[PDB]
């Protein structure tokens, strides 16, 4: 039972995992909030109204 392996699938999986650690976002970037618009500049998602 021989099946053609997918070297690139394993190669891509390791590259993505490595880059997510080397280029991981920091807390100061992830949790920064613009107090005027009450939105996070990292993702552009508005905070819940009750937390304003």
Partner 1 sequence: PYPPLLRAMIIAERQKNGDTSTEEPMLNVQRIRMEPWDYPAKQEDKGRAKGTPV
Partner 2 sequence: RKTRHDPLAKSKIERVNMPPAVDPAEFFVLMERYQHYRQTVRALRMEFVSEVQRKVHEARAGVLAERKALKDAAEHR
Stretch that binds partner 2, among 8-16, 21-29, 41-49 (CB under 8 A): 41-49
Would you give the end-to-end CA distance of the chain in angstroms?
Answer: 60
34 interacts with partner 1 by CB under 8 A = no
Residue number with CB closer to partner 1 (10 or 20): 20
Strand partners, 39: 34, 46
Q: Give the tokens for residue 29.
A: 């970037």
Q: Is the dihedral of CA 42, 13, 11, 4 positive or negative?
A: negative
28 interacts with partner 1 by CB under 8 A = no
Residue number with CB closer to partner 2 (1 or 45): 45
């Amino acid at each position: 039972k021989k099946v053609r392996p997918r070297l690139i699938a394993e190669l891509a999986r390791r590259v993505r995992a490595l880059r997510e650690q080397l280029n991981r976002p920091r807390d100061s970037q992830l949790y920064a909030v613009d107090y005027e618009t009450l939105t996070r500049p990292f993702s552009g998602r508005r905070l819940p109204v009750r937390a304003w």
